[PDB]
Amino acid sequence: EPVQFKDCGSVDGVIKEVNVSPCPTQPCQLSKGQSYSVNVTFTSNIQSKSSKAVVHGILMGVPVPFPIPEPDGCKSGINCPIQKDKTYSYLNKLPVKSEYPSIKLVVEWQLQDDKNQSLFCWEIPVQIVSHL
Amino acid sequence: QSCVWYGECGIAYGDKRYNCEYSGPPKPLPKDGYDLVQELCPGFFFGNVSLCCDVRQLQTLKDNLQLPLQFLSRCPSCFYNLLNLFCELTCSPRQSQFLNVTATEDYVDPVTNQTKTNVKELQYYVGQSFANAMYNACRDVEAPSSNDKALGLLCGKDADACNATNWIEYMFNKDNGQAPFTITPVFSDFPVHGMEPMNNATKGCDESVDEVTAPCSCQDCSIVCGPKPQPPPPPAPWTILGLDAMYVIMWITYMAFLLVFFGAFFAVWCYRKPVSAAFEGCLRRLFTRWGSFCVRNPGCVIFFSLVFITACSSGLVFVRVTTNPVDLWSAPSSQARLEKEYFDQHFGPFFRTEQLIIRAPLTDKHIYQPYPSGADVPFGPPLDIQILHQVLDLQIAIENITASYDNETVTLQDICLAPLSPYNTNCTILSVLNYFQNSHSVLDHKKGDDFFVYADYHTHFLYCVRAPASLNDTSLLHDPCLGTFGGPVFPWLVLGGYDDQNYNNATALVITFPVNNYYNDTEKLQRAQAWEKEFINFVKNYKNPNLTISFTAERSIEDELNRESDSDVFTVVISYAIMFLYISLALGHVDSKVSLGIAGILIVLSSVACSLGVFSYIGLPLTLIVIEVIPFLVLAVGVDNIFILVQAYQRDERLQGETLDQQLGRVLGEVAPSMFLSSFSETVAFFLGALSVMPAVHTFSLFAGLAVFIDFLLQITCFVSLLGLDIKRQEKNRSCLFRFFKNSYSPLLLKDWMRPIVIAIFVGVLSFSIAVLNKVDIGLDQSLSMPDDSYMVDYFKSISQYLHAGPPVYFVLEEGHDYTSSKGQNMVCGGMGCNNDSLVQQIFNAAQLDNYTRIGFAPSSWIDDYFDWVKPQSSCCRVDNITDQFCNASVVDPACVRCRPLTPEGKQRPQGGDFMRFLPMFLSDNPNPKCGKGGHAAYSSAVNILLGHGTRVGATYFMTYHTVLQTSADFIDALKKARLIASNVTETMGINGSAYRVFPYSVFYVFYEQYLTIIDDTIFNLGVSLGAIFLVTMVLLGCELWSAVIMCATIAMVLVNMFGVMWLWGISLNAVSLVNLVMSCGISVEFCSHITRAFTVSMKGSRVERAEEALAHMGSSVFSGITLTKFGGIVVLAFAKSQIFQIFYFRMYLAMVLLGATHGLIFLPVLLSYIGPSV
Ligand SMILES: *[C@@H]1O[C@H](CO)[C@@H](O[C@@H]2O[C@H](CO)[C@@H](O)[C@H](O[C@@H]3O[C@H](CO)[C@@H](O)[C@H](O)[C@@H]3O)[C@H]2NC(C)=O)[C@H](O)[C@H]1NC(C)=O
Ligand SMILES: *[C@@H]1O[C@H](CO)[C@@H](O[C@@H]2O[C@H](CO)[C@@H](O)[C@H](O)[C@H]2NC(C)=O)[C@H](O)[C@H]1NC(C)=O
Ligand SMILES: *[C@@H]1O[C@H](CO)[C@@H](O[C@H]2O[C@H](CO)[C@@H](O)[C@H](O)[C@H]2NC(C)=O)[C@H](O)[C@H]1NC(C)=O
Ligand SMILES: *[C@@H]1O[C@H](CO)[C@@H](O[C@H]2O[C@H](CO)[C@@H](O)[C@H](O)[C@H]2NC(C)=O)[C@H](O)[C@H]1NC(C)=O
């Protein structure tokens, strides 16, 4: 579903949509030990040879780095090399592992190009839920 | 043996320093941080220390323990073992016995290039029973601003699944960001690898760590606290067979009487099938002669009577008026009054209060969701941000008022009371906006990020309703909520409408202006009342459609009564008008004698005014309620006498040779013994009821007695002459009732069958009255003394409906206690070594009961706080070494040392002259953010110091709050039980005599102390009044004890039926109800006397004949005179405006009148016909 997000400065790209699945209500509640799929519709404002996906999670006003399995968006539905002005939507999927707490938080997402300028930047608050 | 890994030279990042490796012997302490060794873990201090420890290691432990100290320091028993664990684990003297380093590497010195081998990792052998006893004994400590477990905040996860092994694992992991290096804990209970772990002694919640440190509370530990206390409620009703046990004793007695009665009558039907005369006779003749004299000397008589009226009523120049309620309702020498005199003298009077009960009707509750974790928290309507801003706006505006009195301006701050002044001078306002300090910025500012708030005003409110004495929220906001005046604001004092702990659910807002009350000073009180007046006007004119305000002021009750007192003189004037209207048409039957009825009204008013003026000379001040309730009564009696006299003349036919005076002397000589009996009986009744101890009833009783007497005298003297003059005068042209009574009423009433029924019915009604007697109320609502359209009524409704706290209580420990000795402190001491039956603990238990005792909260004793303050561990106190001056907790620390030496002996309480030595500094201590509350804002008032003679301590009090008190019964119960607690402590203290005693003081005690003896006061007062009536009656009527005893029995019946009607209309038995009854018992004679006199002085044949003859003759006069006139008066008074009149005077007078009418005109005829004295 298209989710509300706060743009933290998409300078090298234009977000067209952010589709997260499954997320019926927002902030979308993600039950522990369960995989979720992300779709990110964006319009690129620059040409970048490579693409590095960046994820930051903020708890209590403090950013936390979260490493993902894959650091490149071209093997996630992005055709490298990136050409200017083309519109591409990034598709991801990630599993929610156990042991994680049942919080609420803000996902921060950046996409740095060759010159290190974010092709898109959005932030979205999701709450870790239990069995439910 | 020896220690390893000594010092800390490496560094990982930030401040984390890896301990340097050193496997030599432990290097004794550098003698520098003896204090650290003492404060951190004194188990090592028995000096040869040889401790492997380092002062920089101690101070880095101390630095790391900051937040764990803040959370787990609540229950010392737990934080004690946790400290026992770190200190030993780090620099214990047998450190090699329970430790083995694993990872270490060279540490290059940037100072010398010399490699030191840092201790990166090692294993720590911990007993299984130690981690189990530690986590399980401290794991119950709850967190602040929530009812969760503090482990929920220290595990890094819910305190619900942090295993006892996992939390320590998390603590030792450098993955948190706090541990400078990770330590691998080893939970082995047996020596392994020749290495045995260590677990020093541990203490559970069922034990205190030190002989001065109390065990953990049951607030933070579940095992210490067992079954709550409960008192046994005894109803003590007899309830013979299911009902009141009086409904039955009476119904049974009545049936027995009715059976012996129709069992005598029916049986009778079946069977059928110088010693006395010497003192009265001279009275009739004397009175005739004096009446004849006065009829032939009208000028002199009238002149002397006017001279009398003026000489007595000219004293109205000295008329006082008493309006202070204490003077009105309290005897000058009552026990409670003496207690108030002692309390007002040593601690100053209790303060004033201007409340304000705000409410938001147009809003619904909303939910607050804590961002990190937790359950939903609902907030009441009034806790809306918009409503909070508007209420803050109202409060800040209420603060601006500076009413000007006597060309001087007094600000609200100037009149309010500031405990800690002139350091802090703002003033006491007890509102939930003080949690935010009455600042829109403090109320508005949020500590969150987009699409969420991290911390918020609701969150801030949540933390300090839990701990109202903090100096910072200390929870992601770090803003205090202690209050601008300095001193806690207890949440139960500022809110109402919530459910027993859920200040989230509060529905009303409480706000208070305490104002200083002054002892022997009137200009300041005048100034305060002028400010309160302006406060009321403002609040009255404030619109704010979003709010429903209930307000009150200290001087408002007096204003309501002075307001209502004056809006019904129009009632007494209309009453007089109707009395005169009736008198004009009823006085005899241009056949009208109106000139004389007006003369009678003026004589009556003359008697009233004369009574007021004489007593003003005497010095009795006016209550303005009496000046309003007195005239009706006096008018009733005076008119009653006038009609008797005038009508005997109207019905008199002139003999053979009497001009005018001869006839009038003959009539007055035959009528005066009766009128005199009625007047003397009433004067004595009133005066004797003027023996009770209450200045309002005392003074009223005197006034009315004197007025009635003067009225009788002036009336017999001035009016017989003027009646003679009118009688000459009325004739030159310049009965129907008697027919009825004789014709159809007397004969009918005296038939042989109607008479037994009447007697039976009346004895039955008396039986009922005696049955429902002990169900009469005691006390006054305190809400009915106000008009109906008053805002104080709404305020009382609001109080009863919302407030959760009541009037403050002060348990004053009288002068004479020691306070400077172990035992002298133990008898009062609310602590550890002091008795378990100590004053503070006894008050605590009483508050734990809470219903069998109406004392709601803990004492908040000052001596416990003083000791907490003086303890070396707190370290708040600090004196100069040479000047012996108090070093504040915020001070450069140049050379000032701790008050109490930091040794095992110095920890103990200050028993000698040091107690006093340090006490004044405590009372002078301010609220330091590093120290705490300090002892100046709360106890400066509570402690008295006497200069010289060893500087012995003065009288002190321990103030606790009452429970919400709604009814008079509730107030009396509270008084009783406070006295009970004080009595217990006084008895337990075992004084070698009665040199001193504890006693409780509350504001309403002076007004409610009479109801602890009102029953015996009423008994005595009624019995004596009835005995006086009896004696006067058995004397004046001659000596025929039979007639007198009959009259007394009839009046006693009248009183009992008065009590029955009391119970039936819900009138209460206070001192006003009691005065009116003692009066009615004296007004009843007015009825019962004429008939009995007409019976006694009769010479017919049979008892029946005498009774009927008396009925016709006198009752024709008595029914038109006394009954109808009183009835018209009361029906006019039935429309009151003060509630007190309309309830008590109106109902009591209607009852007294109609009861006396029925009794006289019916039960006396029959009872006399039956059992009258033969002759
Ligand atoms: C008086 O105050 C108490 C204090 O909480 C109120 O109780 C709470 O009521 C609210 C009302 O809606 C509930 O949300 C609170 O919580 C429950 O927690 C579960 C999860 O465990 C949630 O799924 C629920 O939706 C709910 O949020 C509840 N909590 C507690 C501890 O009582 C009470 O309502 C209030 N009085 C009134 C009349 O509301
Ligand atoms: C009441 O006491 C407080 C602190 O004891 C005083 O402090 C400030 O009040 C002013 C308003 O005059 C605010 O601007 C400040 O923000 C308050 N202090 C701080 C640090 O914020 C206050 O002056 C005293 N009197 C009144 C009327 O507030
Ligand atoms: C653990 O308890 C032991 C008890 O012996 C402590 O050992 C020392 O302290 C005792 C209390 O005074 C002394 O009686 C012992 O003699 C002394 N040890 C010696 C001299 O053998 C030990 O310090 C305690 N550890 C801690 C800090 O808990
Ligand atoms: C004592 O305080 C009040 C006294 O009324 C008790 O609260 C009441 O709750 C209901 C009325 O509000 C009724 O159930 C009772 O009047 C009373 N509750 C009881 C006693 O069942 C409160 O419970 C009492 N608390 C204690 C500690 O005795």
Ligand SMILES: CC(C)CCC[C@@H](C)[C@H]1CC[C@H]2[C@@H]3CC=C4C[C@@H](O)CC[C@]4(C)[C@H]3CC[C@]12C
């Ligand atoms: C498309 C959606 C699912 C992206 C969000 C992925 C979620 C599951 C990721 C993003 C940030 C991650 C968090 C980053 C930081 C922490 C703090 C750590 O002490 C516990 C794990 C925890 C809480 C992580 C759990 C998993 C996490 C919440």
Ligand SMILES: CC(C)CCC[C@@H](C)[C@H]1CC[C@H]2[C@@H]3CC=C4C[C@@H](O)CC[C@]4(C)[C@H]3CC[C@]12C
């Ligand atoms: C993040 C929260 C839960 C941590 C709470 C527990 C903290 C305060 C405890 C757990 C482990 C402790 C540390 C363990 C290691 C050392 C090195 C030692 O030579 C001095 C004490 C010191 C520096 C301790 C300081 C206090 C400490 C950090």
Ligand SMILES: CC(C)CCC[C@@H](C)[C@H]1CC[C@H]2[C@@H]3CC=C4C[C@@H](O)CC[C@]4(C)[C@H]3CC[C@]12C
């Ligand atoms: C009625 C005639 C005889 C005059 C006597 C009037 C007196 C006793 C009445 C009129 C108003 C009454 C008062 C009404 C209000 C209060 C405030 C309460 O907190 C104490 C009782 C007190 C103070 C009452 C005492 C009795 C009272 C003062």
Ligand SMILES: *[C@@H]1O[C@H](CO)[C@@H](O)[C@H](O)[C@H]1NC(C)=O
């Ligand atoms: C520790 O506390 C737990 C809590 O239930 C208890 O079961 C256990 O017996 C306790 N062990 C002790 C006090 O040694």
Ligand SMILES: *[C@@H]1O[C@H](CO)[C@@H](O)[C@H](O)[C@H]1NC(C)=O
């Ligand atoms: C009330 O206070 C405000 C601000 O403190 C001030 O501007 C005003 O003059 C004061 N008096 C009023 C509003 O009558």
Ligand SMILES: *[C@@H]1O[C@H](CO)[C@@H](O)[C@H](O)[C@H]1NC(C)=O
């Ligand atoms: C007090 O009265 C004088 C005149 O009697 C007047 O001039 C003065 O202004 C008054 N006080 C104030 C504060 O105005």
Ligand SMILES: *[C@@H]1O[C@H](CO)[C@@H](O)[C@H](O)[C@H]1NC(C)=O
């Ligand atoms: C409350 O929190 C801080 C935390 O640093 C504490 O030191 C202090 O007592 C209060 N506020 C400030 C700003 O210090």
Ligand SMILES: *[C@@H]1O[C@H](CO)[C@@H](O)[C@H](O)[C@H]1NC(C)=O
């Ligand atoms: C009541 O609250 C509303 C909230 O916007 C405000 O506009 C209004 O001025 C307040 N007072 C009223 C409506 O009397």
Ligand SMILES: *[C@@H]1O[C@H](CO)[C@@H](O)[C@H](O)[C@H]1NC(C)=O
């Ligand atoms: C209380 O009174 C004394 C001192 O504590 C003692 O004789 C008695 O056993 C104590 N009992 C309790 C339960 O406190």
Ligand SMILES: *[C@@H]1O[C@H](CO)[C@@H](O)[C@H](O)[C@H]1NC(C)=O
């Ligand atoms: C405290 O005073 C005593 C007595 O004058 C003196 O011996 C001692 O050195 C002083 N302490 C300090 C720290 O100056």
Ligand SMILES: *[C@@H]1O[C@H](CO)[C@@H](O)[C@H](O)[C@H]1NC(C)=O
């Ligand atoms: C603390 O004590 C010092 C000592 O004189 C004083 O100057 C300062 O004002 C005090 N501060 C308080 C009591 O808040």
Ligand SMILES: *[C@@H]1O[C@H](CO)[C@@H](O)[C@H](O)[C@H]1NC(C)=O
């Ligand atoms: C007063 O003391 C007696 C005897 O110690 C006790 O029975 C009674 O309960 C006490 N009163 C209370 C606790 O209200």
